[PDB]
Design a protein that fits this description.
Chloramphenicol acetyltransferase (chain A), 4 helices, alpha/beta, Hexapep_transf_CS (chain A), 208 residues, repeat (chain A), 15 strands, homotrimer, four-stranded parallel beta sheet, seven-stranded mixed beta sheet, transferase (chain A), UDP N-Acetylglucosamine Acyltransferase, domain 1, Trimer_LpxA-like_sf (chain A)
């Protein structure tokens, strides 16, 4: 059947994540009706018992679309630089006895705060995505994405920045995702507008 | 699974249930490899609301397995707002003053005799002209002209199916709208490359 | 329910293929947990009962990622060069009675030995993939692929070769996938190395 009761249903990640190697912030939600499973099965090949593997970290206030894929397990035992990509070490067969372990880690996959990931996007092992970034639907993200950068395609590539450099710097500095709730609640209208600078000047006089 | 076999292609009008999905006759979906009927091809389309973007598909379309039609516009996310988090749609009292981020994209309109390859994705608001071909796994972000072939992600121009004049002749004769009797009689001609023939034959019958 | 018991489960192809028109070499495996189904449903539209359709041939020691797609049945009855792409012939309506059969074969799909196919890659009908090739995840493979070539993207495009032209000459020549299993057992450390030249010299003498 289905983890989700409605197409329009978006459940917070911190109510469906079971894998100790997945670390999630508040409010970030996964919208998964079209692919059936909860968030855990978005995160592929991530051993939940091992402390020595690439981990997945997701900030707060993320929007994650249906069927998005986060690839873990690094090269999954396959070494293209070796004579064979075939994972002899992992096929239990008396003849593959002296095989070396091909498994190479790629680094953690870190998703910043306020990231919107489109439906069926695929994030490759070890990539870092900056706060406020947008990943177009069906993207295959193979390298790091800068804060507030919009990328898309396969492999994914620069489309544009959401805002000026000044505004990006103002956002990274004010880190509204970390405000007291009180402040957050007060600022809902500004957050639903394009007035980065007015929000910034305001925060400045309250906070500095 | 909703399809009895891999080769099983059921007409859209035998399976659509969403009032906001409008479909021609003959158009079929072969969705065996993705289990669900065609309704679930059409993502985020409210069936009750008369004020949201619609999906309109014409006659004689061939829609491949797990093709996707994205509705609901930006789905409440505003890239030009400070945050794309859809506060207005989240169940939280701290989000009471949020404004509504939803923006419609316009309707998605697929014309007649359009073939859409398996697992291709159609973005909100795109118009795809008559006789167009959308390659498998295409991500269709902009309108497709009549008899155009496009592919890739984002989908880009590959080819036209025919010359400008042939396209014109086909757009004028509009076989998909002929009386049923003419259609049955045109069967061998339609399974042919002979635009000019059929066109001249049509002219003497219809003008 | 799911064919595979764990995400880390990889079942050999030869233990899960029931379709006579799929020919699979030894040790090749499909790691299919995330798409639930056995390999048979990776292979799309291959009529099991007939001998006049395109077939799938896969070499030994291949590694196939979850949800890889092998498109069979050529043009599926749709003729872009014809007036309509609508498959009249294949639909039941008395009005389509005199339709011509639009089906056309594409040739076999042939994956060589030692091929790694990334998750959710799509191999188009009739393509040939050379030994030791790597197909990136989400590739849409519309053209043939050279031995030891790495491709990715949609449509797939040349990224690079894994080895020099000489080293590729040597591997094609020594074809270690055909060695008796006894030899392989002695060669494991060499196969988990970048030493093509070393093993080559070891093979001839």
């Amino acid at each position: 059947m289905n983890f989700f009761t409605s197409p329009f249903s978006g459940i917070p990640l911190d109510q469906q994540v079971t894998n100790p190697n997945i670390i999630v912030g508040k409010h970030s939600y996964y919208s998964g009706y079209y692919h059936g499973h909860s968030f855990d099965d978005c995160v592929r090949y991530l051993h939940p018992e091992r402390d020595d593997v690439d981990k997945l970290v997701i900030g707060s206030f993320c929007s994650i679309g249906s069927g998005a894929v986060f690839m873990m397990a690094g090269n999954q035992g396959h070494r293209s630089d070796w004579i064979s990509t075939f994972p002899f070490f992992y096929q239990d067969n008396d003849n593959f006895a002296d095989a070396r372990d091909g498994f190479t880690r790629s680094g953690d996959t870190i998703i910043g705060h306020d990231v919107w990931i489109g439906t069926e996007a695929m994030i490759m092992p070890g990539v870092k995505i900056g706060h406020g970034a947008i990943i177009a639907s069906r993207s295959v993200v193979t390298k790091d994405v800068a804060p507030y950068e919009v990328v898309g395609s396969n492999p994914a590539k620069h489309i544009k920045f959401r805002f000026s450099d000044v505004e990006i710097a103002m956002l990274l500095e004010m880190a509204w995702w970390n405000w007291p709730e009180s402040w957050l609640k007060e600022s809902m209208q500004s957050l639903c507008s394009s007035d980065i600078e007015g929000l910034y000047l305001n925060w400045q006089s309250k906070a500095r």
